[PDB]
C-alpha cells in the first residue's frame, strides 16, 4: 500500500466514477434492460443453484455495473451471506454458444490448479467465487423468459466486485482529468509499478495470459490491482488460436498465422501497452482505442502505420517510465524486456523508491 493511496483516490472520485459508469450504460441501454429482465423477470431476487459445491443462493439485483462485448456485469447481493458480488451474464452469439460456455466453465475452474483459497488469499488473480444457474432451468441453454434480440445463457458467473476496471478509469479521466496536484499524479506511478508486479507474478508461475488489457485489470475496494479472465491462462510455450488475443493488443508477430506460441513476451508487450495507456489514455502506434479522445483508427499492427513509439501527446512522464515502456514495447520479441527482469533495472528501482518516498 500503495493500495491505500489508490483506495483513497477512488473514494474521493466516487461520484465522478459513478457518473461515468452510468454514462457508459446509456448507449447499450436496450441490451442492459433486456438482460436485466431475463435474469430478474418478476422478483428482486432470483434463486440460483451452484454448478459446483456451493448449493443454493438468492441473488438480489443492486445495479448494472458494466457492459462487455458478450456480457453484462451486475452488482448483486447475497443477503443471507451479507455479501455483494459482480455477476457476469452472457448473451448468446454464437460467441457464447452452449459448448463455448461449457468450455469456459471447465477452463475457469481448473485455473487454480494451473488451490482456490490460496490463489484467493494471494490477491493477484481475480478468481470467480461460483458459477450458478437459475433454478429449474437447464444450465448453459437459453434462459427464459427470452427477450427479443438478446438471448441470455443460463450460466451466471459470480466474482468479487472490483471498484473500477482500468478501462473505465481511463474513460473517466478522459472525461474529467481529476489529477491536478503533485500528489494526485502518484496514481500513475503506482499503477505503473502495480502493473509490472502483476505481470511479473504471471512470469514467476510460468504462465501466459494474453488478455492483459485494461478491461481485465481491476482496482479492488482495498486499492489492490488484480488481473481477471483466469480461463485464458496457459503454461508458457504452449500453442493456441491466435484469435484469442485481442487484435489491438497483439504484438506484430502474433498477426501472421491462425495458431501461435504463447510466450512471456506476449504479456510483456501487453504490459507495455497498459502502462502507456496509464500515462496516455490512448494506445500507442495510432492503434484504435474506442471511447478515448485523441485515438487514431489503426485496426492492428499489420496495417501500415506509425511504428515508432511516440510520447508527445501523453501526460508528462518521468524518463525512467519512458524507458521501461520502450523496452516492453520492443518489436524484437527475443530482446523484449520481461517483467521479472524489469524489476531489477535501475528504472524500476527508481520508480519504486520515489513512490515509497512520496508515500512515507
Amino acid at each position: 500500500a500503495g493500495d491505500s493511496f489508490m483506495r483513497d483516490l477512488l473514494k474521493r472520485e466516487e461520484e465522478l466514477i459513478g457518473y461515468c459508469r452510468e454514462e457508459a450504460l446509456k448507449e447499450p441501454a436496450a441490451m442492459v434492460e433486456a438482460v436485466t429482465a431475463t435474469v430478474w423477470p418478476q422478483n428482486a431476487e432470483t434463486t440460483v443453484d451452484s454448478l459446483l459445491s456451493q448449493g443454493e443462493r438468492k441473488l438480489k439485483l443492486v445495479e448494472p455495473l458494466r457492459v462487455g462485448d458478450r456480457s453484462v456485469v451486475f452488482l448483486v447481493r447475497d443477503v443471507e451471506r451479507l455479501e455483494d458480488f459482480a455477476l457476469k451474464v452472457f448473451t448468446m452469439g454464437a460467441e457464447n454458444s452452449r459448448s463455448e460456455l461449457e468450455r469456459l466453465h471447465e477452463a475457469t475452474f481448473a485455473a487454480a490448479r494451473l488451490s482456490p483459497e490460496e490463489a484467493r488469499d494471494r490477491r493477484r488473480l481475480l478468481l470467480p467465487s461460483d458459477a450458478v444457474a437459475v433454478q429449474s432451468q437447464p444450465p448453459f441453454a437459453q434462459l427464459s423468459p427470452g427477450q427479443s434480440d438478446y438471448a441470455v445463457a443460463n450460466y451466471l458467473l459470480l466474482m468479487p466486485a472490483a471498484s473500477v476496471d482500468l478501462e473505465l478509469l481511463f474513460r473517466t479521466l478522459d472525461f474529467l482529468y481529476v489529477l491536478r496536484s503533485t500528489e494526485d499524479f502518484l496514481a500513475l506511478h503506482i499503477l505503473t509499478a502495480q502493473l509490472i508486479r502483476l505481470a511479473a507474478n504471471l512470469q514467476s508461475k510460468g504462465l501466459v495470459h494474453g488478455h492483459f488489457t485494461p478491461d481485465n485489470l481491476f482496482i479492488m475496494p482495498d486499492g489492490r490491482l488484480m488481473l481477471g479472465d483466469v480461463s485464458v491462462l496457459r503454461k508458457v510455450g504452449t500453442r493456441g488460436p491466435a484469435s484469442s488475443v485481442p487484435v489491438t493488443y497483439a504484438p506484430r508477430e502474433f498477426l501472421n498465422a491462425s495458431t501461435a506460441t504463447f510466450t512471456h513476451a506476449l504479456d510483456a508487450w501487453q504490459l507495455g501497452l497498459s502502462i502507456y495507456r496509464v500515462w496516455c489514455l490512448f494506445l500507442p502506434f495510432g492503434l484504435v482505442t474506442p471511447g478515448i479522445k485523441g485515438s487514431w483508427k489503426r485496426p492492428s499492427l499489420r496495417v501500415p502505420g506509425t511504428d515508432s513509439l511516440a510520447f508527445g501527446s501523453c501526460t508528462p512522464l518521468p524518463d525512467f517510465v519512458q524507458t521501461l515502456i520502450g523496452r516492453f514495447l520492443n518489436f524484437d520479441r527475443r530482446r523484449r524486456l520481461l517483467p521479472l527482469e524489469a524489476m531489477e533495472t535501475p528504472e524500476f528501482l527508481q520508480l519504486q523508491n520515489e513512490i515509497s518516498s512520496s508515500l512515507s
Binding site: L176, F311, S313
Partner: protein, 390 residues
C-alpha cells in the same frame, strides 16, 4: 501655463504604463516645442505617429491539434469561426507549415497558426528554429484539458534559451461543465478554476521553468474568465510604440477593453492636434473647410470600425440597430440644420462640458474637439451595443 508644459502635462493625466509614446520621445517633443521651430516640432510628432502606425505585430500560437489555436486566433480578430477569413482546424497540421492570419481591420497585427510539434518530426529546439521563434512579439502555447509532454518540452526549451512565452489553457468552460455534471455534490466553479490554475503554475515549477503568464479562458465566452487580463498583460509587455496598433485591434469584449481603447485614442488626438498647430481663436466661433470635413468623416469611420459600430458590424447584428446608437446619424443631411451647424453644436456641448483643454488664448483647431466628441460618442455606442449582445 506655458504650452510645452500643457502638452506634456496631458499625458500625466493618464495611468502610468498606459501611454502611447515613451518619455524619451515626449521629452524630445517638449524640447523642440520650446525651441519654437514649428516645422521641427511638427516633424517629431509626425515621426512618432509614423512609428506607431507602421509597427507590425507578430503573434505565434502553438499547441496540440484541436487545442483551440484557430478558435483563439479568430476570437482575437473578432471573426466568427465560420465567417470569411476565419482560421480553420486541420490545415496547419496537414501542411506542417505556419500560416499567418491578419487582423481584418488592422492588417499590421498578424497571428501565426503554428503546427503542433507532434505534427512535425522536429525536436523542441529544431521546432522553435523552423517556426522562427525569434520573430514573434508573443509566443503563446495553447493547451486544452491537461498538460501534454509536447507542451512542456517546448516550454522547457524556451526556458533554456532564457526566453519567454505565454501559457493559455483553453476550454475551461468544458472543465467547469464536466465538474458540475460529474461531481455536483462538491462542485464550486471558483474552486475548479483555482485548482486548474494551480496545476498550471505548479507544473511549470516542477519542470524547473520560471512561472510564465498563465491564462485560463474559453474561446466560446470571450467576455469571461481570463481573456481581458490576457489582453492587459499582452499590451503591457509590448514596447510602447507597438501598443496602439494592438490595442485598437482588440475585440470589444468588455466595457474595460472599450474604455482603455478610448484613453489611447485620446492621446493620439492630442498628438494630432499639436502636430496641426494650435490657433488663437476659439473653436466655438469657427467652421470647417471641405478638407477638414473629409478628414472628420474618415476619422468617424475609423473610430466606428475600431469600436465595432461600423455599418458592416451593424449588419452582422439593420435600421433597427442603427437606431440604437448615435454615430450612424451624424452625417445624415437634413433641412433642419447643415453639417456645419450640427458640428458647431457638438463643439458647444464638448467645450461647455470639458473646456478648451489649454491655457487661455490658445486652442486646438476645431476639428480636434470634434474628434474628441466623436470618440466619446462611438465608445458609448460600442458599450450600448455590447449590452444588447450581452
Amino acid at each position: 501655463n506655458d504650452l510645452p508644459s500643457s502638452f506634456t502635462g496631458y499625458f500625466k493625466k493618464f495611468n502610468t504604463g498606459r501611454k502611447i509614446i515613451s518619455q524619451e520621445i515626449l521629452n524630445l517633443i517638449e524640447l523642440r516645442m520650446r525651441k519654437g521651430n514649428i516645422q521641427l516640432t511638427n516633424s517629431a510628432i509626425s515621426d512618432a505617429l509614423k512609428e506607431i502606425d507602421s509597427s507590425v505585430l507578430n503573434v505565434a500560437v502553438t499547441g496540440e491539434t484541436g487545442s483551440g489555436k484557430s478558435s483563439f486566433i479568430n476570437t482575437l480578430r473578432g471573426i466568427g469561426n465560420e465567417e470569411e477569413g476565419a482560421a480553420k482546424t486541420g490545415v496547419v497540421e496537414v501542411t506542417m507549415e505556419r500560416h499567418p492570419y491578419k487582423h481584418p481591420n488592422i492588417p499590421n497585427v498578424v497571428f501565426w497558426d503554428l503546427p503542433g510539434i507532434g505534427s512535425t518530426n522536429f525536436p523542441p529546439n529544431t521546432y522553435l528554429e523552423k517556426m522562427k521563434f525569434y520573430e514573434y512579439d508573443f509566443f503563446i502555447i495553447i493547451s486544452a484539458t491537461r498538460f501534454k509532454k509536447n507542451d512542456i518540452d517546448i516550454a522547457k526549451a524556451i526556458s533554456m534559451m532564457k526566453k519567454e512565452f505565454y501559457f493559455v489553457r483553453t476550454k475551461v468552460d468544458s472543465d467547469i461543465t464536466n465538474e458540475a455534471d460529474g461531481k455536483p455534490q462538491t462542485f464550486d466553479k471558483e474552486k475548479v478554476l483555482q485548482d486548474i490554475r494551480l496545476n498550471c503554475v505548479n507544473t511549470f515549477r516542477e519542470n524547473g521553468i520560471a512561472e510564465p503568464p498563465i491564462f485560463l479562458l474559453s474561446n466560446k465566452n470571450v467576455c469571461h474568465y481570463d481573456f481581458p487580463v490576457l489582453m492587459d498583460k499582452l499590451i503591457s509587455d509590448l514596447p510602447i510604440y507597438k501598443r496602439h496598433n494592438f490595442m485598437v485591434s482588440l475585440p470589444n469584449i468588455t466595457d474595460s477593453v472599450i474604455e482603455k481603447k478610448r484613453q489611447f485614442l485620446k492621446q493620439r488626438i492630442w498628438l494630432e492636434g499639436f502636430a496641426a498647430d494650435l490657433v488663437n481663436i476659439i473653436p466655438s466661433l469657427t467652421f470647417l473647410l471641405d478638407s477638414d470635413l473629409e478628414t472628420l468623416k474618415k476619422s468617424m469611420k475609423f473610430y466606428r470600425t475600431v469600436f465595432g459600430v461600423d455599418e458592416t458590424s451593424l449588419q452582422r447584428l439593420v435600421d433597427q440597430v442603427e437606431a440604437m446608437i448615435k454615430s450612424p446619424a451624424v452625417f445624415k443631411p437634413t433641412d433642419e440644420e447643415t453639417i456645419q451647424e450640427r458640428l458647431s453644436r457638438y463643439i458647444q456641448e464638448f467645450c461647455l462640458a470639458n473646456g478648451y483643454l489649454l491655457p487661455k488664448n490658445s486652442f486646438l483647431k476645431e476639428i480636434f474637439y470634434l474628434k474628441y466628441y466623436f470618440l466619446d460618442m462611438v465608445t458609448e455606442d460600442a458599450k450600448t451595443l455590447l449590452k444588447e449582445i450581452c
